[PDB]
Scaffold this active site. Sequence first.
Site, PDB file in Angstrom:
ATOM      1  N   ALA A 281      35.752 -45.743  21.707  1.00 42.62           N
ATOM      2  CA  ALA A 281      36.618 -44.759  22.385  1.00 42.62           C
ATOM      3  C   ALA A 281      36.153 -44.377  23.788  1.00 42.62           C
ATOM      4  O   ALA A 281      35.095 -44.796  24.230  1.00 42.62           O
ATOM      5  CB  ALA A 281      36.753 -43.511  21.541  1.00 42.62           C
ATOM      6  N   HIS A 282      36.910 -43.583  24.477  1.00 43.12           N
ATOM      7  CA  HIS A 282      36.572 -43.262  25.817  1.00 43.12           C
ATOM      8  C   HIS A 282      35.289 -42.536  25.873  1.00 43.12           C
ATOM      9  O   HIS A 282      34.994 -41.762  25.032  1.00 43.12           O
ATOM     10  CB  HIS A 282      37.670 -42.473  26.524  1.00 43.12           C
ATOM     11  CG  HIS A 282      38.004 -41.168  25.881  1.00 43.12           C
ATOM     12  ND1 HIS A 282      37.698 -39.903  26.217  1.00 43.12           N
ATOM     13  CD2 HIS A 282      38.727 -41.078  24.730  1.00 43.12           C
ATOM     14  CE1 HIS A 282      38.228 -39.094  25.258  1.00 43.12           C
ATOM     15  NE2 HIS A 282      38.839 -39.827  24.366  1.00 43.12           N
TER      16      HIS A 282
END
Lengths: 341, 341, 341
Positions: free
Chosen positions: C238-239
Site C-alpha cells: 500500500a501507499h
Amino acid sequence: MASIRLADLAQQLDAELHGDGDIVITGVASMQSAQTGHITFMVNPKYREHLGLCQASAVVMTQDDLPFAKSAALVVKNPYLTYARMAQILDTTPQPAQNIAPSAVIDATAKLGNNVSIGANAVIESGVELGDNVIIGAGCFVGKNSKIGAGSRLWANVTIYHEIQIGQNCLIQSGTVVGADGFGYANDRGNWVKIPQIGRVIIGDRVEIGACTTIDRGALDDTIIGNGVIIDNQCQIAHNVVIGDNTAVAGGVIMAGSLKIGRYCMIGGASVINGHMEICDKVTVTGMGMVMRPITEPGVYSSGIPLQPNKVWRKTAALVMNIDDMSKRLKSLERKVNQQD
Amino acid sequence: MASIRLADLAQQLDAELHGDGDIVITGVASMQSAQTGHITFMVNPKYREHLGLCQASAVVMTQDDLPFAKSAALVVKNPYLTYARMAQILDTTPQPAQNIAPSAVIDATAKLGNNVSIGANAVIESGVELGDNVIIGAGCFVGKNSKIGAGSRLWANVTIYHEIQIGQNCLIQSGTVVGADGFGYANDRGNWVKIPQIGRVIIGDRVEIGACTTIDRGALDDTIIGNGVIIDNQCQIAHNVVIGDNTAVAGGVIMAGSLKIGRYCMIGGASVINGHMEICDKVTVTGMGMVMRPITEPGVYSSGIPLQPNKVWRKTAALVMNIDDMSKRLKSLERKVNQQD
Amino acid sequence: MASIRLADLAQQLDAELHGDGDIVITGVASMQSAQTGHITFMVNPKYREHLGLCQASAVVMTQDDLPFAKSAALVVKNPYLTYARMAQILDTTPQPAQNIAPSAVIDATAKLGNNVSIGANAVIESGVELGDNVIIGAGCFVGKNSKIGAGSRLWANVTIYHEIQIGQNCLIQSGTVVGADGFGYANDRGNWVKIPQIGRVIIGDRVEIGACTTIDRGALDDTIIGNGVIIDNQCQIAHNVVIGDNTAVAGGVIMAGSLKIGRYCMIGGASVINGHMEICDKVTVTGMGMVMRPITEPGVYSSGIPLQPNKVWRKTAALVMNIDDMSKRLKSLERKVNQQD
C-alpha cells in the site's frame, strides 16, 4: 497553470487567509518535505511545536492552532477535508490518455461522446458506447456492447468484458478485470460442465476500483456495484455479489457468490466472506475477518488470533487443538467437587 | 443467434414437453426476471408458490412439481443440469476474436492450425504452435516455443510465457499469467542471488483458469495441471506444484512450491497450503484453511475461528493467548484436589 | 555457439575434471529426465544409487560420492551452488525483447541508452528514461517521466505509472502494476472524497518483483522498496510503505498503508500486516501471520491454528468461541476449593 495565489485558493477552499494573499503556491506536500511554494496541513495534534522549521509557504490549520502559526495560514473547520480539496485543485496526476491514438483499434460501430480520449493500443470492440469526457488508458480492452458513463476513466491495461455497464465519474486502476465468467459449474459424477454465464456487471456512479482487482459477472442476473463504492487492490468479487452504496472494501478481500452487502459498510483487508448470504447496513469487518454467517445487526465484528512470538505461539496452538481434552478435565473436577463434600 | 422451438430443445435436453410445443424461445432468464421468450427453470422447491406470476414461457421442473405448471413445463430428473445445457444451446457469449486482426504481431515462424482467430495487438512469438479452432484474445502475449492445443481460448490480456504447453478446449480469463519465474535463490553475503528457472508449465485438457491467476514455471522439472481442473481467480500456484485430474480450486488460494494435490480435491477459497507436501485424492479443505501438514486420508478439513462481535472477540482473543495460564492453573488445581484431598 | 565442452565448463565452473573432457553439453537438467548433452547435479546424499539410470553426460558431485560415480563427474565443495552457476551460464531463457519493435509506441521526448530493447505494443510515455541494456517486454506501459535504471527488465504486460523510479538490475514479472493510486479518501457526510495520490514509488537496485503484484504510490511522500528486496506473486503493498534492504516477502502478503519494515526481514505467504506501524530488522513472520501490533524485537513470530479434521474442528471452534465461559467456570471453582478449606 501549475501555480495559483494563496488568496485565490483560500476563496476556493473557503478558508480565512491569515498571511500574505499573494504567496505563489505550486503544490501540496507533507510538513516534513515541504519547500517554498508548497502548501501543507496539520490535522496533527501537536506538531505545531515544529511549525518554525517547516519550510512550506502556508499551512492549512484550525482556528485553535493559529496562535502557534509561523507562516501564512488558512483557517478552516476541517483541515483534512481541506487537504483533500486543495490536492484536487493542485493535482499533478496526468490523464491516462489525451485524444485518440492512431494505434488504437476502434470498431466502426462504437459510439463516442465529445472530448473522449483513447490511448495507444487500446481495443474498443463493437457496439461500445463511451460517454462525454471518457478516458480510456493505453492497452485497455472494452468488450462488445459495453457502456462507459461520462467522466469515467480507465488507466492502462484494464480489461472490461462484454455487456458491462459503468456509471459516471468512475475511476479504474490498471490490471483490473471486469466481467470474467463466474466460477460456476454443473456436474454428473466427477467432472464438470460449464454453465455459460450470461449475467452482467452493473457499476454505479462515482465508483473507484483499484489495481489487479477482479469482478465476475453474474450467472443470469447481475453482479452490482452501488454508487460511491470504493474498492482497493486485488479484491475478488464473485458472480451476483451485490455491494451497497458508499461501502468501502479494503485490499485483498475475498467475496463469494451471491453475497449481498449493505450501505456504509467497511470490509477490512484480507477478509474472506462466505456467499449466498447477506450483510446488513453499517457493518464493519476487521482485517482478516472470517465471515461464514450472515450479519443481521450493525456494529463491528472480528476474528483471528493475532501474532505472537514463536516459542509462545507453539504452546498456544497446541493447547487450542486440545481444548477438548482440556474442556473435559474441567468437567471432571466440576463433578468431583459438586457431589463430594 | 435466433431462437428455437421449445420442442426442438426438449429433445436435445432429453425432457418431457408438457404443453404448447411451438412456443418460441430467445434465451435464458431467471424466474425473477423472465419474460415471454425466456426459459427459466426450477428445482427451487418452495418457489412453486410464486410460479403463477413468473413470466417465463417455459420452466424446467421435476415431475413432483408438474401439478403447479402455470406454463409449458419441461420434466427431467436433474434441472440444474438441464439448465446447464440449454444454456450452452442458447449461449450469447461472443468470441474473444474472429479472424486474424491486422494489428496482431505474429512471428513468421509460428505455426497456426485451421480457423484460428487472433485478437488485436496480440503478440505471438517465434516457434509458437496454435492448434485448430484456437482463439487468442486481444492484447494477449504468447511466448517463445509455446504450444496451445485445439479448441483452446484465451480471453483478452492473458500472458503466457515461453515453453508453456496448453492442452485442448482450455479456457483462460483475462489478466492471468502463466509461466513466470518462481522463488529461486542462493545467498551471496546478505543479498539473494537468482537461479534461472528452466522448467516449464504443462496444462492438461479442458482446464478452466480464472482471472488474474498466477501459475509459476517449474525449476527444472515442471508445474503440472491435470485434466479438467478448475482454478478460480487470483490463485497463486507456485513452482513445481502438481494438481490432479478434476480437482477444483476456489479464489485467492495460495499454494507453495512442490505441493502435489491429488484427483477430485476441492480447495476452499483463500486457503494457504504449505509446499513440498502431498495432499491425497478426494480431500476437501474448507474456506480459508491453513494447510501446514501433509494430508494422508480423504475427507474434510477445516481451520480458523469464525466472526464474533468485536466486544466478544477481544475477550476471546485475550483468553486464547496465554491459555498456558489456564492450562497450568487447571493442572495446579487438580493437583491440590485429587492428590491432597 | 549455444553449447560448450565439458573440459571448458568444468574450468569456468571451478570444478575438478573426472572423466570425459569432450561431450557436447546442451544444458542443465534434473536427474529423472536428463540425457546426453545434459549436465545434472546431485545434492542428495542418497539418490546416489539411482545415478546409474540417468543417461546424462555429466554430474556435479561431492568427493564422498565419487566412487559411486556412474559416468563423467565434477567434484566441488557445494553442488547446489555450482548448479546455480551452471544454470546461470547455460540457460536458454529468452530476453523479454530484443532491440526495438516496429509496433512499440515511443514518445519523441523519451530517452533511451545504448542497446535497450522494447517489445511489441509497448507504450512509452513522454519524459521517460531508460538506462543502458534496459529491456521492456511486450505490451508494457511506462508512464510519464518514469525512470528505469540500467540492466533492468520488465517482462510482458507490466504497468509502470508516471513518476516511478526503478533502480539497476531489477526484474519485474508480468501483470504487475507499479505506482497506482493508494487507497486514500476523506469521508464527507458518508461520501468518500478522493485524495489525489501525488507521491511516487522509489525502487532500489537488485529488486525482484513477481507477477500480478500491486505497489501503490504514496499520498504525498513516497513508497519505497529498498535494494535487494524480493517480493513474490500477488502481493499488495500500500501507499507509503517502506521496505528496507534485502527483505523477502513471499506470495500474496498484504501490507497496509504507511507500514515500515526494516531490513533483512522474511515475511511468509498470506501474512497480513496492519498499517502505520514499524517492524524492526531481522523479523521473520511465518505464513498467514496476522500482524496487528508493532514488532520491536528481532526474532520469529507466528499465528494461526493449524488444520484439523472437520469433525474435530467443529468442536475446537465452539469451545474456543465460548472460552469466556470456561475461564469463568475455572475461577468460579478455583475459589470454591480455597474457600471450603
